[PDB]
Structure 1
C-alpha cells in the first residue's frame, strides 16, 4: 500500500530509478505489468541456446551509464565477432569488404555517399540534444519525412538505397513514416552516423555475458519484494495529498511521487484523474514504436568464418527478409548463430508466415549471401516478434512522425504534478537504447530527490565518467572527406569553369 515512490515499469529504466531511490534511503515499490522484469530486454534460457537475447543486447563505447550499472551488478561484456570480412549484398550479388564501411569505387557515387553521411552529421550539429525543437530549421525539417530528405540529398540510387536501409536498421521504421528532424536528432544524440552504425567503436561492439536481461533481474534481486510482478497499472489519482496508483488486480498503492518508466504511448493504458494536461493527452496518441522480428538461426559451426566472413551482412533488396545480420556465436566459440533483424514493413509482412516458413526464408537468404550450402542446415531457431507485445508496443523504440516533435516534443519529460517521466524515450544521449534507459531512470529519480529537498537542482542532470573497460575512440574525418564536393557542388564547379 504505502511508500515514498511508485515506479511504473520494471524495465531497465524503472529498475535503474528504483535502485537509485532505494540506495538514497527511500521506500520504493516497482509495479510491473508482466510476469518478468526487463521489458524490451529479454534473455531466453534453454538447453539448445544456453542463453539468447531476444530484445536489446548490444552495448558500445560512450554508453557509460549502462556499462557502469552492469559492472556494478557483476556483469561482463564480450566483443561481437568482426575479425573476418563484412558483406554488402546489393542487386543479388555479395561484395566482401574489410573495415567498417562498404567501399564505393565509382567517383560520382563516392561523392554522393560521402556527402550524404557528412550532411546528416552537419544537420545534426544544428540540433540540440536536449531540445531538438530548438534547431534553427526545426519546423522545416520536422514537416518533412526522411524519405523527402533522401530524395533531396541523394543524387544516386546507390546512396538512397543504402541510406534507406540505414534508416530501417536504426529506427525499425520506413523512411516515409518518420520525421526528418526526429531521425536527425536520434542519430546525433547517439554521437553521429559512425558511432551509431559501427561494430568496432560503435553501438554494436559488445554484448553482456549471460544476456542483458540480467541487468533488470539483478536489480530485482537487490530490491526483493519491492518489485511487484503482474501488476499492470490502470489508474493514477493525484486529486488528494498522496498519489494513488491502482493496478488491474485491484491493488492500491499510495506514494508521494510516481515515476512513469514505460514507452510514452503506453501511458494510454492508464486512466488519469484529473485528466492529463492537453499537450500530453494528445502526445501519447502520436508516438508509435517500430516493428521488428529478431531472429537467431543456430548452426553446428560458425562456417562463415572459414570462408573469411565475420557474419555481418548488410543486405539490400525487397526480396530479402533480413536486411542486417551479426555473428551471435558465444564468446567461447560454441552455439554458432546468426542474428538477423526483420525490419519495419517486412516484420508486418512476414508475421503472417509460420516459424518454420520464416526459418526457411532466412536460411535460403543466408545461403545465397554467404555463398554456402551449409546455411541450409540450421540446428535450432529462435525468434521474437516485438509488434505483438501489449506492454512494449513495438521495438526498438518510439519514433516521431512528421509534425510531432516540434509540436509535442517539449512535453515528453515535463512532470505532471507529481508524475515524473523516465523510459529511454526521455533520454538526451542514446535515447532508444539501454544506455538511455539508465540515464532517464536515474535523472527522473533525481528530479524527485530535488522535489524532496534532498539534493540541489545542479545534481538532477549528472555526467558519467568514461568506462575504463570500453574506452571510446574519437570519430575522425580525413581532409578529402570534409572538403570533397557534393554531386550538385561538382556540377556547380563544372558550369563555372565552362562559362
Structure 2
C-alpha cells in the first residue's frame, strides 16, 4: 500500500529504530522499512542446536552512556562478563603464558614499547577527538600513512606493533593494518574514549544485555507497531526540495518530508536515487567498506577453563584465533566461548571446508585453554559476509586516505535524505552505542529544521 509520514526510515537496525523512537517522542510520524523478516540488523539473538547465541553485537562498555540510558529506558538489564582468574597470552613465537595484570607478559623491551605506544595513542586520541578527526591540523599526515607503517615509524619492536595492531585492526576495524590509516586508528581509540579503554577488555567487553542485544531493537520496534514494515527491501528513492517517495518490495510506497538512510554505507548504492546523488556521494560511498570477522561460538558441558583457574580470555596476535573470551550466558550452567578470526585470516579459513575450518579454529582455541576446547557440544560460526543486507562485520570504514578526504561529508544530508548508521558515528563508532547516537542526532537534526 501507499502512506504519508513526516520521516521514512530505511532499515530497522538499532540506528534507524533509535531515530524512529526519538522522532515519535517529538510528535512526528515515521515509517521504518526493513529488508529482513526481523529487526536489529547487525544485532541478532538466535537459538542454534538448542543454544542461545548472540550472532551480532552484544557488549556494553561503561563509556556507552547513550546506550546505557536507552537500556534503562526500555527496562532491560545487564550483567558482567566472567573475569576471575588468569588470562592467556600467546607470543609471536607461539609461546603460551598465563597472566593476571593489565599488561601482557612479554619481555621488558616489548613491554616498554607497548606502554609508549598506548600513551602515544591515548594522547593523539585526546587531541584529535572522535567528532571531526579530519578537521585536526594533524589529520593529513596521520591519514596518508597506514597504521602498519606508522607503527614502524614509532617503534622497532615487531611484537609490540603486532599487539597494538591486534586492538585496532582485528579488534575494531577487522581489516589488516596495512589497509587503513593511523588517523583511522586514532579515531577508533577516541570513539571508545581512549586507547587504554580498547586495551582493557574489562572495559570494552564489560557487560551484556540479559535477553541479548537484539532486545534493544525488538523493544523499540514493538512500540512502533504497524509503522514497522518487515520483508520490504527499499529499491528506489525519488526526491526533491520538498520531500521524498520511498518505494519498497511488496508494492510499498512511503511519501515523506525527509528520509533516513539507516544502513551501512557500503549498501547505499543498493537503492536507485531519482535523481542520482551528487558526484561527491557517488565517489565517497565507493571508498567505504566493511571488515570481515568470523565470530566463533563454542558451547561446552561446563565452563571448563574456570576449573583450571582461567578467565577464558586469550590474546594472540599471531594465532588464527586472536581473541577468546568467556561468553557464558546469564544463568546458564553450560560454558560458552566467543572467539574471533579476523580479516585475512578469516579469508583463509573461509577458503577451507566447513569441517577443516572448524578443526583449525578449535585447535587454536585448544592452544589457549587446553584440549577440552576441541570437544564442544554446539559449534557455530557467525557469517555476516554472506548476508546480502550486511556483507561483513563489524563496521564499514574508509579505505586508506578516505577518512580525511571524505570524512567531513559523511553525515551531511543531501536535500531531504539523511544518513544514520554506527559506521559514521563519533563516540560509539561501529558499536550499538554509535548506532543509537547517530539515530538520535539525526532525529534532533530533523526536529530543529522542522
C-alpha displacement of 1:161: 1.9
Counterpart for residue 479 of structure 1: none
- Contact 1:180-1:402 at 8 Å conserved across structures: no
Coordinate RMSD, CA, aligned:
1.5
Gaps of 5+ in 1: 453-499
Counterpart for residue 121 of structure 1: 122
C-alpha displacement of 1:350: 1.0
1:133-212 equivalence runs, <5 A: 133-166=134-167, 167-200=169-202, 202-212=203-213
C-alpha displacement of 1:333: 4.5
Structure-1 separation of matches of 2:127 and 2:279: 29
Structure-2 separation of matches of 1:373 and 1:143: 44
> SS of the residue aligned with 2:223?
helix
> SS of the residue aligned with 1:40?
coil
C-alpha displacement of 1:46: 4.8
Q: Considering only CA atoms, is the larger Rg found in Structure 1 or Structure 2?
A: 1
- Contact 2:241-2:416 at 8 Å conserved across structures: no
Structure-2 separation of matches of 1:67 and 1:223: 21
Deviation string, structure 1 residues 441-466 (Cα, Å, up to 9, x no partner): 011011111111xxxxxxxxxxxxxx
- Contact 1:386-1:394 at 8 Å conserved across structures: yes
> SS of the residue aligned with 2:8?
strand
1:248 correspondence with 2:249:
yes
- Contact 2:234-2:247 at 8 Å conserved across structures: yes
1:276-287 equivalence runs, <5 A: 276-287=277-288
Relative to 1, partners in 2 of residues 1:75 and 1:354: Cα closer, same or farther, differing over 3 Å?
farther
> SS of the residue aligned with 1:255?
strand
- Contact 2:7-2:258 at 8 Å conserved across structures: yes
C-alpha displacement of 1:179: 1.6
- Contact 2:180-2:400 at 8 Å conserved across structures: yes
Counterpart for residue 270 of structure 1: 271
Deviation string, structure 1 residues 125-166 (Cα, Å, up to 9, x no partner): 331322111111211111111111111112212212212222
Counterpart for residue 236 of structure 1: 237
Structure-2 separation of matches of 1:254 and 1:422: 19
Counterpart for residue 398 of structure 2: 400
1:362-373 equivalence runs, <5 A: 362-370=361-369, 372-373=370-371
Structure-2 separation of matches of 1:115 and 1:66: 32
Counterpart for residue 379 of structure 1: 377
Counterpart for residue 420 of structure 1: 418
> SS of the residue aligned with 2:360?
helix
TM-score (norm 1): 0.86
> SS of the residue aligned with 1:254?
strand
Structure-2 separation of matches of 1:34 and 1:18: 18
Gaps of 5+ in 2: none
Deviation string, structure 1 residues 353-399 (Cα, Å, up to 9, x no partner): 343333222222222222x2322211111211222121112111112
> SS of the residue aligned with 1:86?
strand
Structure-1 separation of matches of 2:438 and 2:187: 17
- Contact 2:126-2:194 at 8 Å conserved across structures: no
- Contact 2:321-2:365 at 8 Å conserved across structures: no
C-alpha displacement of 1:2: 1.3
Deviation string, structure 1 residues 378-431 (Cα, Å, up to 9, x no partner): 111121122212111211111222221111111111011111111112321111
- Contact 1:280-1:408 at 8 Å conserved across structures: no
